[PDB]
Amino acid sequence: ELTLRTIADEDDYESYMASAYSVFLRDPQKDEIEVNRKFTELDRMIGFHDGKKWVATTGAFSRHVVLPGGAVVPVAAVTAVTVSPTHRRRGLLTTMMRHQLADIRSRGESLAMLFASEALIYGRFGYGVATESAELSGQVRELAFRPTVDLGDGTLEEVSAETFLASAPAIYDAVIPGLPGQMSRTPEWWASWTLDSEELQKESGKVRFVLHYESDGTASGFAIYRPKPGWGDAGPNAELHVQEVLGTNPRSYARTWRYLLDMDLVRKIKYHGASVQEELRYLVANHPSLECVVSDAIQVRLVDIPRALAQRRYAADVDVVLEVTDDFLPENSGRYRLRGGLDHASCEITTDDADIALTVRDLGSVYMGGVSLQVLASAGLVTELRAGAVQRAATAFGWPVAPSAPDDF
Amino acid sequence: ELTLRTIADEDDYESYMASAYSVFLRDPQKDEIEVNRKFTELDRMIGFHDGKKWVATTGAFSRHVVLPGGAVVPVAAVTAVTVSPTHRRRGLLTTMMRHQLADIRSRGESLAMLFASEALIYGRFGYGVATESAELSGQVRELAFRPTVDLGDGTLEEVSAETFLASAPAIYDAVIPGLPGQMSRTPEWWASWTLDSEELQKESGKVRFVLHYESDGTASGFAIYRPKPGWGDAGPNAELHVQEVLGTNPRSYARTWRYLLDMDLVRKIKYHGASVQEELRYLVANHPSLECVVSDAIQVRLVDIPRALAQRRYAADVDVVLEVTDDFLPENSGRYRLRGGLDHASCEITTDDADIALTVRDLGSVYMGGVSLQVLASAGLVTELRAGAVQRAATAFGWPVAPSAPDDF
Amino acid sequence: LTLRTIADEDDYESYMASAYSVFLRDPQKDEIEVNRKFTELDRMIGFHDGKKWVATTGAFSRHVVLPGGAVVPVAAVTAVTVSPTHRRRGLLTTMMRHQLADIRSRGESLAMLFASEALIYGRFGYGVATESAELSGQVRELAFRPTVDLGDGTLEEVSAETFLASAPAIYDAVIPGLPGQMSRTPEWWASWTLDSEELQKESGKVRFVLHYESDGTASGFAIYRPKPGWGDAGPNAELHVQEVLGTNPRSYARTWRYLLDMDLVRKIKYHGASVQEELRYLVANHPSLECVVSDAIQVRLVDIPRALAQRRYAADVDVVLEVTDDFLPENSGRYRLRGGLDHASCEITTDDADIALTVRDLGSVYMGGVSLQVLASAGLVTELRAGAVQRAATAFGWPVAPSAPDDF
Amino acid sequence: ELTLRTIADEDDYESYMASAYSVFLRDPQKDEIEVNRKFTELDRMIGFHDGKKWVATTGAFSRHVVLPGGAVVPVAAVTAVTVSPTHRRRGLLTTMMRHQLADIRSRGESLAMLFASEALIYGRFGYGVATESAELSGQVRELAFRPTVDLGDGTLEEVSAETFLASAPAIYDAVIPGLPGQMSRTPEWWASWTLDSEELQKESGKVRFVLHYESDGTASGFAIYRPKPGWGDAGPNAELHVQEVLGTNPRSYARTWRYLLDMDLVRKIKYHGASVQEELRYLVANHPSLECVVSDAIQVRLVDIPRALAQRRYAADVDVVLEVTDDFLPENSGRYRLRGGLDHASCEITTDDADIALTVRDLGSVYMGGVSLQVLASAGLVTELRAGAVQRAATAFGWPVAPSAPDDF
Numbered sequence A, B, D: 001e002l003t004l005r006t007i008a009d010e011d012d013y014e015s016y017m018a019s020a021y022s023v024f025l026r027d028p029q030k031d032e033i034e035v036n037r038k039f040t041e042l043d044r045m046i047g048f049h050d051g052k053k054w055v056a057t058t059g060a061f062s063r064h065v066v067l068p069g070g071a072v073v074p075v076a077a078v079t080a081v082t083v084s085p086t087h088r089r090r091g092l093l094t095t096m097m098r099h100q101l102a103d104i105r106s107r108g109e110s111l112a113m114l115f116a117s118e119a120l121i122y123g124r125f126g127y128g129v130a131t132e133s134a135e136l137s138g139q140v141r142e143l144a145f146r147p148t149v150d151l152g153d154g155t156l157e158e159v160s161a162e163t164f165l166a167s168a169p170a171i172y173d174a175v176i177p178g179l180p181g182q183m184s185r186t187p188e189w190w191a192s193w194t195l196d197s198e199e200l201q202k203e204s205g206k207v208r209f210v211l212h213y214e215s216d217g218t219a220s221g222f223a224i225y226r227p228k229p230g231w232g233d234a235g236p237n238a239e240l241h242v243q244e245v246l247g248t249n250p251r252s253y254a255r256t257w258r259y260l261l262d263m264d265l266v267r268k269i270k271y272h273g274a275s276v277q278e279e280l281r282y283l284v285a286n287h288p289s290l291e292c293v294v295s296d297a298i299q300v301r302l303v304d305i306p307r308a309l310a311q312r313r314y315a316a317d318v319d320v321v322l323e324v325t326d327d328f329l330p331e332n333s334g335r336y337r338l339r340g341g342l343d344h345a346s347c348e349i350t351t352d353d354a355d356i357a358l359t360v361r362d363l364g365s366v367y368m369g370g371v372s373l374q375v376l377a378s379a380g381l382v383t384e385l386r387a388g389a390v391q392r393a394a395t396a397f398g399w400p401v402a403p404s405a406p407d408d409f
Numbered sequence C: 001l002t003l004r005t006i007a008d009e010d011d012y013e014s015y016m017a018s019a020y021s022v023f024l025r026d027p028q029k030d031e032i033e034v035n036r037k038f039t040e041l042d043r044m045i046g047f048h049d050g051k052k053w054v055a056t057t058g059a060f061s062r063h064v065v066l067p068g069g070a071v072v073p074v075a076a077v078t079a080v081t082v083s084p085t086h087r088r089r090g091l092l093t094t095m096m097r098h099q100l101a102d103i104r105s106r107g108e109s110l111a112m113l114f115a116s117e118a119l120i121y122g123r124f125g126y127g128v129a130t131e132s133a134e135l136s137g138q139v140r141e142l143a144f145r146p147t148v149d150l151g152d153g154t155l156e157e158v159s160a161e162t163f164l165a166s167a168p169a170i171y172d173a174v175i176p177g178l179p180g181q182m183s184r185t186p187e188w189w190a191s192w193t194l195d196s197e198e199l200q201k202e203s204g205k206v207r208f209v210l211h212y213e214s215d216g217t218a219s220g221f222a223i224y225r226p227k228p229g230w231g232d233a234g235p236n237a238e239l240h241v242q243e244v245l246g247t248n249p250r251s252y253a254r255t256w257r258y259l260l261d262m263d264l265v266r267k268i269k270y271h272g273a274s275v276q277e278e279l280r281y282l283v284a285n286h287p288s289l290e291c292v293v294s295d296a297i298q299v300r301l302v303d304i305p306r307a308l309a310q311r312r313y314a315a316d317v318d319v320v321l322e323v324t325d326d327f328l329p330e331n332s333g334r335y336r337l338r339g340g341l342d343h344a345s346c347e348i349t350t351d352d353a354d355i356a357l358t359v360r361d362l363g364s365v366y367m368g369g370v371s372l373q374v375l376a377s378a379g380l381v382t383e384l385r386a387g388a389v390q391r392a393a394t395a396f397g398w399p400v401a402p403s404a405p406d407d408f
């Protein structure tokens, strides 16, 4: 009695997103649904309909992601995955995953990426956790920088969203080629990212925008944050909830952070979704004053295995044969020779002996340089077939800059 | 009125350690002081004495540490650093550091390592945070393993310390060449590590020892843990405080963890001082069920710069000229050419142009592969002088297995 | 001060506003509007000082299931307040005298209420007769015993309107077996299912579930609110359950299982359950469902021989009760109760008494939720003939404990 | 290989109890282990021994229990059930239950009773939760009694354990025939129950004993309690932890409670293990001021079904045929005619048509009058075969005084 189909029109879109919020036990956020519609492609939003309502949903945004080495490649940003409590554990998600992965392949996207409400959901479909994020937090009065940290001669301004959006996109585009995992932001995505959502206001305050300018007036850094006022038994106790800080040079980055850390009335700061190798972690004079809680961020599903492996660059030279088992999509299973380095990458079927045996989820887990292939082999999740192969492959799959979580979807 | 000197005899040793505990605001632990005396060299324990008592202390243990690549080299394990509250902030620590670093150099140790009560203390002497540790914890009923994790056909036994110490040292020696940062354990160090200290008992329970045996009877894994009994509103609520788990193969490691996780009455587990890349993190089916809190562990002070850089191995080939500034010991400043890879390492003074400029503390921070030289350069703490040099040097200084904290000192 | 009833609609608004004010709350417009539709102004009394109401006391005309399944009229006492400017001057005592006389004249044999503070009402002859359980736990610890049959039914999330087309008939069929439950008219259902703003602030919007047999017959329902949440290691939502009922064991168990298996949920809470809620025995691990027990309904017997003759008794009894009614001494007397599963009669007698008790303690045992024998062991009830309390206590019991009705 | 055997001697007893405590994640309590030995029979304490140590335990004490109606019958008080974490989930418990239930049967005990660390353990062996207990607690200043509660004219004395034990046993013996579920206490059991255990001292204070005397000097009530001193921001905040209060008449019960409730410096009282129909619950003027948290207490295993059913008395007349299915002891499965009332009880196999079908665990659950057979039928756990049959049987298996938990074992 169920029909697998895409969103037909705008009313159908409202009904679809309403069902998704209901499965997440939330009232539909009108402001979020409206802004996100502007980068939603209805034919990428599938689900099951019982004739009366949507009982399952699964969607994807057409996005682009930075790989190690700086290439920006199309990626399916999977989103809105739900099944109604009346229809769960009957394989509806499994069916939607089969359809979606086939659709992703046909659109020429070599991989898919998602955040997981519960990480164990997706490994069975070939996804592997590839990126972690850090919640960084501390008492601002304990976060002095090392004495050598140059703050430069720039200035900061608090600006409107409109003024922010006139300079922040150019700053963002200049920085993210060095930050694998970040995704391109069209104006539509910036509108969602800077939305002063009612949900986030309730936990803190209205969103604020900061621009950092060099002494010649060039915008070179920005911050997005929300204040949470507060008072304690001995004085003020406000908290800054930082959404994002970027700078095109070390001085603009350090100076923008110092602006936030030195704000009056503030005693606490928290940066959710930072990099596990966020520069700020090493700027501070006292390392543990910046607490660091690490969790899963992005899972990667490699859809076109040899294409994806050829699209990134590798931290050192590698020539390795990978026996890749794709349990959910066995047509992808194969023996692939990967030849790669800082300046090249190629991958194709080979009949030569395999060096390493691994599943496609674990190949996905190592793909962004955030999980060590050698640790997975030590854990017994990956099998070395030829001596020394994992050593060199693990280093090549790594990268000197940890992957980091993109803006959320 | 102060005399800088070493510990003279056993009574002087008691007085010395008593003053150290007093500065740490603690009653002297008789059991710890007694067991640690057996690997203490009195001539390595310096301090200031006012004629009546010790007013400052600084010591070092002669130890050996695993570097990336597996070499085990002598290291000064710095310990017992205190200055009495009546004599603080008059430069006594600074003076003891000058004496100790000279003594370390003369003994042929190329580097020193320490844990820091407060990490910001030691950077001014050339130490850099090189290793982080993870507190791993979770509800045991949320820590099921991935379906492919083979537990093997081994068995576990709860044993006496004496029985544990007859098999655990051989297991430990076989595993740690793959775990840079771990230190050699003599019988004397094992006696300290396995001490059923009264302090740790108060927070949990008596220390317990587990041995894992292969089906042929070969000891292949071990665990040290303490139970903390407890009851909640709806049933038992005990907590296991894990001190150490090791295995010589993936099955013994996974099986020993499963033994602890499946213990009856237990609801919570915590492993302090794990690796930030602990295998257990990737064995679990649901990544975030194992919470991960990351902090500083070991700081490295390079004492013989070219020797230390030649004693480890590098994850890929590197040929780089480092302009190294040693602020505390300016005689070490110099321009060093590092040539290294998986199979070789050499380092010596050169007059060729420098590729990278950095201080000795930051060279120490990257030395164990736990901090990325590229991130330090992005943070502005290190300066790239020639294009592309940091990229290749950062990868070479890395390693496919994160460094991890040794047993404490 | 004038003791009067509500005179018109604006007077109703002002009366409810003063009552909310005594409870230290802002008047809830949605609740005041819906409850008006089953309010009889002539049953809402109070004191008015010329400028405002300074005391209130009211009753709804309801009907309650007694042990044995009889459904009888009951005064559902409500909206009892005295302003802080006029408290401890006897205003409540006066309203209680008037109201209890009014209840008697309307042919209701008993009154029932919930109490903000239970010690208020004993002095007027009320006794706590029913208790309720807050049942809660981690949903992943609430697996059922292996023999619990979930049957072949299905569940659907439905609108309030769809819910109210099926739930009343399910409710009507179940409650004759649940003494203490009260009849629900459409107006009472509208209040019970109101998506009140105050409950939204604590959790979420109210949701409705219908359970259908494999042939399509609606046989169970649930009312619940979700409270989303996240912890340090994953989701941590809570389900706040308002009511679950089923006309057979399979639909009851399947409906609970639907709630317990909901994704992202980790905690469930059922306020106001029975102390013998079937769920307590379905779960494989008894203490995984925490159980906190408190007072629910207090009973005031207004026509003692009628009330005692209207219920049925779990076993045969022939006992003479010497009843003392301090507040309404016209009720004091010696009554012969003869009763059993299939009969009940009560009348004044001159025969020797077997048991001496107050009207409040007679009310406490009237619903089978408090043991007359425990009250005698406590010294609150006096046995005058050996063996009498044992047999009367069993007769006043019932194999299904009384449970709390919907709020009033 | 493993050997199932009983404890052989006193050293063996020490090792057995030590393994039991170890499985409970506790250090062995020397005080408890020595006092409890005095009522232990070594031939009732079974377990598995691997040649080197005990790896599982299961025992029973020979006790006697009050049934509805006042009869005091032998019961196996099951105790010390553990399986070592090295040997769990291999059926060792099941094998010990198989042996123990046969042993109980042969000793002529008609039933067994236990407390459960986790209640779901024992249903599979035919145990049913039959008695609940209440933690009763509150602010003593909120626990005034109803105005008609007569305190009588007795007096109270604080006494030594020795003086307490000269009067409390006779008070207890006279009261418990009216409290089904209570167990007889020999001098040896009293010694355990009044032990000033070091565990309970750490949570509160040393155990204290109170006697209540009638005007003629007769001891008629007692209390066992521990104080927990404390101070708040606005004055004292001590707590009384009550272990037991009993009296032979309502005045001595009420006066003894009033003595505790009126103690100076106290603000909070807690009574663990009370009856869900404890008289105190009805003495208080404000019912909810005495908070009431209810959980499982005793599980019952009917071993000789027709004898156990004939040993208790029934709250009203009953004549019912029970089709009983006993899963773990199928030798007990059969169709039994129960005829009973306040003054008689008989039970025997019958071929008459059955009225009710139920499992032995649910017959055990209703056996003490603490769980309603009618509610279990409404839940679907019990099946009514002839209309109206459950109604009268449920009333008969009930009792006007709720069963209550005995002293711990």
Ligand SMILES: CC(=O)CSCCNC(=O)CCNC(=O)[C@H](O)C(C)(C)COP(=O)(O)OP(=O)(O)OC[C@H]1O[C@@H](n2cnc3c(N)ncnc32)[C@H](O)[C@@H]1OP(=O)(O)O
Binding pocket: A023, A024, A078, A079, A080, A081, A082, A083, A084, A087, A088, A089, A090, A091, A092, A093, A094, A095, A114, A115, A116, A117, A118, A120, A121, A124, C263, C264
């Ligand atoms: C991309 C995004 O939108 C961010 S991720 C959000 C995912 N959605 C949610 O968390 C909202 C609440 N949960 C749901 O709506 C459903 O549980 C989801 C997660 C969509 C799954 O839908 P179903 O239709 O129930 O999945 P289904 O294919 O039946 O499951 C196939 C396997 O996946 C497992 N699985 C699915 N969801 C799971 C879960 N939440 N936790 C644990 N296991 C889960 C099922 O147990 C089954 O395992 P087996 O029986 O093969 O051993």
Ligand SMILES: CC(=O)CSCCNC(=O)CCNC(=O)[C@H](O)C(C)(C)COP(=O)(O)OP(=O)(O)OC[C@H]1O[C@@H](n2cnc3c(N)ncnc32)[C@H](O)[C@@H]1OP(=O)(O)O
Binding pocket: B023, B024, B078, B079, B080, B081, B082, B083, B084, B087, B088, B089, B090, B091, B092, B093, B094, B095, B114, B115, B116, B117, B118, B120, B121, B124
């Ligand atoms: C190896 C081990 O034993 C593990 S590390 C444990 C270190 N010991 C403790 O934490 C115990 C309590 N603290 C102490 O005993 C003393 O504060 C320690 C940490 C030993 C330092 O002794 P002092 O004699 O006071 O150090 P001193 O040479 O005077 O300090 C030189 C610089 O180091 C800075 N410094 C020293 N200890 C510091 C501290 N704890 N926090 C922040 N800054 C500190 C001083 O402010 C000064 O900076 P400046 O004036 O040059 O800008």
Ligand SMILES: CC(=O)CSCCNC(=O)CCNC(=O)[C@H](O)C(C)(C)COP(=O)(O)OP(=O)(O)OC[C@H]1O[C@@H](n2cnc3c(N)ncnc32)[C@H](O)[C@@H]1OP(=O)(O)O
Binding pocket: C022, C023, C077, C078, C079, C080, C081, C082, C083, C086, C087, C088, C089, C090, C091, C092, C093, C094, C113, C114, C115, C116, C117, C119, C120, C123
């Ligand atoms: C049916 C429902 O609406 C659910 S129950 C909600 C009851 N209302 C509230 O809780 C709102 C806040 N409280 C109030 O409005 C007043 O305190 C209420 C409860 C209406 C009582 O009004 P008053 O006019 O003050 O009562 P009054 O007849 O003077 O009191 C008669 C006896 O009852 C006692 N009493 C009354 N309310 C009490 C209370 N809340 N707590 C303790 N004792 C109380 C008085 O102390 C007095 O005892 P004594 O001096 O004769 O020994």
Ligand SMILES: CC(=O)CSCCNC(=O)CCNC(=O)[C@H](O)C(C)(C)COP(=O)(O)OP(=O)(O)OC[C@H]1O[C@@H](n2cnc3c(N)ncnc32)[C@H](O)[C@@H]1OP(=O)(O)O
Binding pocket: B264, B265, D023, D024, D078, D079, D080, D081, D082, D083, D084, D087, D088, D089, D090, D091, D092, D093, D094, D095, D114, D115, D116, D117, D118, D120, D121, D124
């Ligand atoms: C009388 C007293 O002493 C008070 S009760 C104390 C019980 N002992 C403890 O709690 C100490 C910690 N736990 C233990 O020592 C062991 O887990 C106990 C409870 C003794 C069970 O020993 P085992 O040897 O592991 O039991 P075993 O016969 O293998 O289990 C038979 C069934 O009983 C289930 N079960 C046993 N213990 C359980 C438990 N603790 N929780 C949940 N299920 C349990 C097992 O899963 C198995 O189910 P299935 O596979 O047949 O579906």
Ligand SMILES: [Cl-]
Binding pocket: A123, A124, A125, A126, A127, A325, A326, A327, A328, A359, A360, A361, A362
């Ligand atoms: Cl896979």
Ligand SMILES: [Cl-]
Binding pocket: B123, B124, B125, B126, B127, B325, B326, B327, B328, B359, B360, B361, B362
């Ligand atoms: Cl330096």
Ligand SMILES: [Cl-]
Binding pocket: C122, C123, C124, C125, C126, C324, C325, C326, C327, C358, C359, C360, C361
């Ligand atoms: Cl009364």
Ligand SMILES: [Cl-]
Binding pocket: D123, D125, D126, D325, D326, D327, D328, D359, D360, D361, D362
């Ligand atoms: Cl059974």
Ligand code: NA
Binding pocket: A175, A178, B378
């Ligand atoms: Na950059």
Ligand code: NA
Binding pocket: A243, A244, A272, A273, A274, A405, A406, A407
């Ligand atoms: Na972020």
Ligand code: NA
Binding pocket: A378, B175, B178
């Ligand atoms: Na290894």
Ligand code: NA
Binding pocket: B243, B244, B272, B273, B274, B405, B406, B407
């Ligand atoms: Na460690």
Ligand code: NA
Binding pocket: C174, C177, D378
């Ligand atoms: Na029913």
Ligand code: NA
Binding pocket: C242, C243, C271, C272, C273, C404, C405, C406
């Ligand atoms: Na209710």
Ligand code: NA
Binding pocket: C377, D175, D178
């Ligand atoms: Na009695």
Ligand code: NA
Binding pocket: D236, D263, D264, D265, D266
């Ligand atoms: Na006091």
